[PDB]
Amino acid sequence: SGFRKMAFPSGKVEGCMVQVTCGTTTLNGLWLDDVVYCPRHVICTSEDMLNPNYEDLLIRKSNHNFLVQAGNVQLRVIGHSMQNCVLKLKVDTANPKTPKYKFVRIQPGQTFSVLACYNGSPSGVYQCAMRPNFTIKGSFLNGSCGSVGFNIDYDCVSFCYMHHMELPTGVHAGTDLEGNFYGPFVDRQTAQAAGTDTTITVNVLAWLYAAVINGDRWFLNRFTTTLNDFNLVAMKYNYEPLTQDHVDILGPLSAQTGIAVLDMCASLKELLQNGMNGRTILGSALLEDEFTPFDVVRQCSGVTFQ
Amino acid sequence: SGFRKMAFPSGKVEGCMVQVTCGTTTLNGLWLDDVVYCPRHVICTSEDMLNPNYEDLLIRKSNHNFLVQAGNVQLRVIGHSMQNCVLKLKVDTANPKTPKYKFVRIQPGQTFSVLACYNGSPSGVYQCAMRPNFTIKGSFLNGSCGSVGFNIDYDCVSFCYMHHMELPTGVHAGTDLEGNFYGPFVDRQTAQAAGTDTTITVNVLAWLYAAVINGDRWFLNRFTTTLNDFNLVAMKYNYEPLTQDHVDILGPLSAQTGIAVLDMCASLKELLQNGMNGRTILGSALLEDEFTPFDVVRQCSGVTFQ
Ligand SMILES: *C(=N)[C@@H](NC(=O)[C@@H]1[C@@H]2[C@H](CN1C(=O)[C@@H](NC(=O)C(F)(F)F)C(C)(C)C)C2(C)C)c1cncc(Cl)c1
Numbered sequence: 345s346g347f348r349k350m351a352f353p354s355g356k357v358e359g360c361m362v363q364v365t366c367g368t369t370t371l372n373g374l375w376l377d378d379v380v381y382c383p384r385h386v387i388c389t390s391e392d393m394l395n396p397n398y399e400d401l402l403i404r405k406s407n408h409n410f411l412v413q414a415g416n417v418q419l420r421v422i423g424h425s426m427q428n429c430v431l432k433l434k435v436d437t438a439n440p441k442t443p444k445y446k447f448v449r450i451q452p453g454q455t456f457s458v459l460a461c462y463n464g465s466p467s468g469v470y471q472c473a474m475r476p477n478f479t480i481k482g483s484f485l486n487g488s489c490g491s492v493g494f495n496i497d498y499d500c501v502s503f504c505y506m507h508h509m510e511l512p513t514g515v516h517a518g519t520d521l522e523g524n525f526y527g528p529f530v531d532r533q534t535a536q537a538a539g540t541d542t543t544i545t546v547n548v549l550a551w552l553y554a555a556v557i558n559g560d561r562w563f564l565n566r567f568t569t570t571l572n573d574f575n576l577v578a579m580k581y582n583y584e585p586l587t588q589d590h591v592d593i594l595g596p597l598s599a600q601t602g603i604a605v606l607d608m609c610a611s612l613k614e615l616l617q618n619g620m621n622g623r624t625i626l627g628s629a630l631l632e633d634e635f636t637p638f639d640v641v642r643q644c645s646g647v648t649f650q
Numbered sequence: 651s652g653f654r655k656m657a658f659p660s661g662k663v664e665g666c667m668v669q670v671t672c673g674t675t676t677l678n679g680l681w682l683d684d685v686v687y688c689p690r691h692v693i694c695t696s697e698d699m700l701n702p703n704y705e706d707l708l709i710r711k712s713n714h715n716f717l718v719q720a721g722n723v724q725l726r727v728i729g730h731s732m733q734n735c736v737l738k739l740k741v742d743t744a745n746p747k748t749p750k751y752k753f754v755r756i757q758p759g760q761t762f763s764v765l766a767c768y769n770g771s772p773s774g775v776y777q778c779a780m781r782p783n784f785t786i787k788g789s790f791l792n793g794s795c796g797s798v799g800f801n802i803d804y805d806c807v808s809f810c811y812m813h814h815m816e817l818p819t820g821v822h823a824g825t826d827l828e829g830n831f832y833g834p835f836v837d838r839q840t841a842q843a844a845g846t847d848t849t850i851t852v853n854v855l856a857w858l859y860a861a862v863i864n865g866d867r868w869f870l871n872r873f874t875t876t877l878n879d880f881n882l883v884a885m886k887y888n889y890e891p892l893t894q895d896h897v898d899i900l901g902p903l904s905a906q907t908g909i910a911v912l913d914m915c916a917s918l919k920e921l922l923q924n925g926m927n928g929r930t931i932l933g934s935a936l937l938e939d940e941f942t943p944f945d946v947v948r949q950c951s952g953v954t955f956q
């Protein structure tokens with residue numbers, strides 16, 4: 345038992361991380377087969393980032409303008425192109441550590457692991473959710489750009505995120521691995537800001553089920569509620585709507601605990617209207633929304649990856 | 651910016667994880683050079699675990715009684731011995747992925763990363779603290795025994811923990827890698843229980859400094875306090891004493907934020923006496939004590955590992 349914010353083992357991604365330097369900017373790249381992916385703003389200078397024309401900036405670059413460091417081994421760049429907001433650096437060596445992988449784009453509300461990196465050297469791993477407003481509450485310092493987010497499904501790494509920028513509230517914005525931003529953000533220095541967020545209701549319910557599985561039951565009750573009446577309360581407290589599909593997705597957890605989904609919604613309703621009254625759930629005094637139903641099943645059943 | 655419970659990249663440990671089977675019990679082993687380390691209770695049957703004489707149980711075992719699986723490759727056991735509460739299985743192949751490593755024993759209050767594993771297959775990574783009562787609040791299911799805890803310092807893995815057992819409160823007990831239990835726990839089925847815990851004061855202060863670095867300041871105040879007067883409040887609220895050495899260790903964070911250590915103690919005193927009044931710190935409504943001053947510097951400055 346127990347419930348931790350658990351990331352996927354990072355080894356398979358660690359073997360792909362490289363350092364990409366252009367001019368005086370160094371950031372991280374993802375090396376898969378003979379291509380290194382990195383944020384295209386690597387080609388920008390300080391004043392370039394005020395309002396950049398990336399096509400113009402890139403045509404003025406040369407293969408030799410890109411220094412790629414894989415550990416203590418230089419990688420020779422033999423081609424370069426732009427795909428949306430990422431750069432694809434063609435190199436003369438295919439990464440022998442390339443895992444089986446996919447490029448997937450995730451939904452707000454879904455979670456992933458982040459391998460935070462500096463100078464192509466992994467520093468730490470942690471679990472994030474894609475917020476409803478398409479930001480992530482990460483932990484990133486200068487030089488972290490190009491660090492990637494991912495999930496692992498048996499042996500295949502599904503890359504879903506690459507870090508580009510920090511917004512003024514301290515949250516983070518980036519792209520999928522085809523270079524398309526998550527959310528209404530751009531890789532230039534504007535006054536862009538996150539925009540209003542909501543709480544991921546289905547995840548809160550999943551985490552309440554994890555709590556029951558782990559012996560926290562004080563918030564339970566005999567009351568029930570209807571989906572429509574729950575969603576009136578959700579809207580009130582800035583939670584997003586619960587759909588029938590969410591109810592279906594929570595089925596396995598409902599069955600394992602014996603607590604009907606709508607019953608647990610009644611519990612959540614009471615928690616929202618009354619607070620916790622000094623008590624905690626899974627060591628938290630706040631309602632946690634960055635565990636999906638899948639994450640809960642993973643940790644409260646025990647699936648591995650190879 | 652941002653502050654996450656961040657684990658070390660797990661790759662170097664993933665390459666050491668193997669499956670150890672004896673009889674009908676399968677658990678995880680740690681494969682370094684030509685030795686596989688695992689909990690000695692692997693040799694016990696259900697009724698053996700009621701009150702086992704491990705020397706007697708092991709003399710009745712044979713090298714061929716131990717099946718070691720490294721991925722889809724069997725490892726031939728050529729020797730076996732007991733070192734305190736771990737088994738050392740001598741195998742005919744040295745692990746080619748053996749990192750530089752050390753066996754270190756940590757102090758309560760210190761943190762480490764755990765690579766949770768099942769059938770020698772890593773499942774997830776997360777960050778733990780050694781509680782003052784020598785338990786850890788982990789996330790472990792059946793088959794997780796032999797999963798290890800560790801820290802990484804540049805390129806060297808300092809193994810500090812191997813998982814043995816779950817206590818009735820859902821917390822976890824285990825050994826260092828020489829097989830010596832953390833805390834007053836034994837690898838047999840008694841009525842053993844965790845025993846009273848305290849809050850790691852120096853860590854709470856470190857996390858308050860992380861909060862200030864990340865822009866949370868509402869809990870700050872002009873008040874100060876003396877070390878002795880703070881420690882009277884600490885004792886009251888089941889916090890452990892703050893020493894001058896703790897104050898010294900917090901020096902760098904104090905200097906980076908401009909908030910004197912004893913001033914931040916005054917802030918903590920007010921937080922303990924008044925609560926948070928509906929506000930949060932670094933996304934928590936509770937005072938967090940599983941980040942050390944080192945962890946805070948790591949994440950609020952940016953050190954990597956290779
Ligand atoms: C990556 N190593 C670094 N981020 C950047 O260089 C990105 C990048 C260029 C500026 N920038 C920012 O993150 C800034 N953020 C902005 O929203 C804006 F550009 F100013 F509009 C800022 C002020 C945080 C430096 C572009 C947006 C494309 C980085 C990444 N993550 C965290 C940190 Cl501290 C730095």
Ligand SMILES: *C(=N)[C@@H](NC(=O)[C@@H]1[C@@H]2[C@H](CN1C(=O)[C@@H](NC(=O)C(F)(F)F)C(C)(C)C)C2(C)C)c1cncc(Cl)c1
Binds near residue numbers: 840
């Ligand atoms: C490991 N794969 C598994 N743990 C065990 O088999 C350990 C082991 C034997 C029993 N045991 C326990 O964890 C039990 N805990 C006890 O405190 C006691 F033995 F009963 F006293 C129990 C009841 C949880 C199964 C010894 C203590 C040496 C395991 C590890 N972590 C979590 C889980 Cl769910 C199982």
